[PDB]
Amino acid sequence: MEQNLPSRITKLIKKSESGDFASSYQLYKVFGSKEYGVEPDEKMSDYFKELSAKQLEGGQLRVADIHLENYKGFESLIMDFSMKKNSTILVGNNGCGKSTILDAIQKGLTHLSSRLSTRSHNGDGIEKHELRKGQNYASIAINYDYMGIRFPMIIATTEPGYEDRAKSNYSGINELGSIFKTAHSINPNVSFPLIAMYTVERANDVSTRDIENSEEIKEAQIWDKFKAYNKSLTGKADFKLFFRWFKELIEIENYSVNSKTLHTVEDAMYSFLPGFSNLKLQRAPLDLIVDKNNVSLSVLQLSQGEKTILALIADIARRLTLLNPNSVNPLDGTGIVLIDEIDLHLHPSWQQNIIPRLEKTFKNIQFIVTTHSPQVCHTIDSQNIWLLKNGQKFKAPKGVRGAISSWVLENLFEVAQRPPEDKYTKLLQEYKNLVFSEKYASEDARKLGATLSQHFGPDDETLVELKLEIEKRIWEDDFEK
């Protein structure tokens, strides 16, 4: 018994001995110290931490909740994300605040990225410009989820001259970094959680104009796993390093890595982009070649939407392949990818398929995203759509998935289906009033009906309904006389 209680330890350690990762982490939370009824023994606790290092096979680093106080327009707002649906979409009016939450999550991950990388520096605190006018403190409290153990993190800044109340207890990110560092130590071929952030500036990077002159090809970039997070928590993505990557891989193709990673990355944009095949490089003027419906075009005059959706998934796939070692399925790892303004330079035929394609291609990735187009919204269940409004969170109305655009507008975006002050819709309202007001055919409803009939035609849905009403009511005047 080792003088320690063998009841609860054995109740909670059998699965750990079997291979469960959560039980070992739970053990090395109280076994070493004296926080529960267990004695302060440091043998089994350290053995459990060492063993739990080598127990991560499949998981997902996911943001679970965020708590903000006086950060940026928000007095207090406690989000609660999803651990089953891998897509949360924030919807609201421009001015209520969505990039506030996105920036808060980015600030939270700026320290996790450093904790997981070989470095140990800190990220960024709350700037002076990120405090409410006439306010004294702020907090960015965020919790994370690996295979099932909650890991907190608080990033708070207070003005010394007014009050000193809040603290900054990073805590669990250090433990997570210890787990991943030990996992690398036991075996370098271990998957890491991706972290990425994509602002509204993804477009201003895609250009193959003097790559040799500009940057990122006149270096000796060593392709490793830890440093893949370069410029990942920033705005514009990496297309020039992307082109460096194609150059190196295609030139070395001339073993297995060239046949695997290059093929998989190609298939990514091959599936996302309907009709862009047979990628190849251009050597003399140093550009890219794409075959759009069997005509060859460079990457300097392709459609802007194709450019953005190229760079986005290209960066995601590149970082997933760099972070993951030799594996049959290298795009299915883990990560928290934030994509602000998904409905950016896109056509209403791709906005209805952007999310399912992302989830089918990259399965085990969280995709906290903000949108402003209904066609993006009604592809996802209502339980995963927040409607931030007036500084407080309201969840989307019931049954958004598989709905119609007009209803989504009216009942979620607070936008009228018809234009609010178009003269023809005001005439339509006046007609609808006249039909039901026992005053039809008094020389003032017929002219307006003809005016609306000449514009919409005799086939518009609502006008046919009003025609049915007038026909039935002119039937009434017959049998009553």
Partner: protein, 258 residues
Amino acid sequence: LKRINKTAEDQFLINFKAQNPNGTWDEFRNHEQGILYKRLKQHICNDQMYLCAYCEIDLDRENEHEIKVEHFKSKSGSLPGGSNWHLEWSNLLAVCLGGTNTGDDFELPANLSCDSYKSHYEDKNKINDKDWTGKILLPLTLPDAHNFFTFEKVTGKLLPNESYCNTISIDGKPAAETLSIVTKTIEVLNLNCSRLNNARRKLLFHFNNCARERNLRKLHNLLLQWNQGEPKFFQTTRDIIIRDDRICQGLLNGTIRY
């Protein structure tokens, strides 16, 4: 809100009250499991013909989880030694979900109606005295033929009336001010919300498509389907539409006959 008539108890809500004087509703739900709760829900719904007391919509006849039971006088207003307002079988009504599924308390107030916006009103304006009997219409003691509600065919709203509101009295109040009672009944529950004003306006669509043919026989069939018995959903609005058509009214009372 129609006029629902309760029949009698079945000596199974009697035994539970006998073994436990004070009232806690969650205790009744977390009883020997689903049996008593299943059968109370069944016996309550069958008296209402599987319809909602507040907003007349079709409750699913083969899925309990879409069926909820609402206490008219709120269960938050029970007083120890004053009343037992959790289990009296005159405060139980069968209601829909009301635009919510989990009751997260973070759903839009405008969408919520029928039953949940009652609670939303109570929280928002801090109605301390949960004695709604007298200010909101009780769907158990109304007249069986109510001319209360006027169907505004334009937007689908249900609006108060001048006639029949200064004639009949409810809950012993003076008959000269029932209009305020009806208006507050509309406000507390939002029968005039989007998801119901755009659902009652389609019964008008049906009634007017069954009149395109200019055939009185089809209108006869529609009237004998909408005014025969076994009330269907939105029966009150059905009755208003039949009562607002002079051809239909003539057909049902002699003059103008086929």
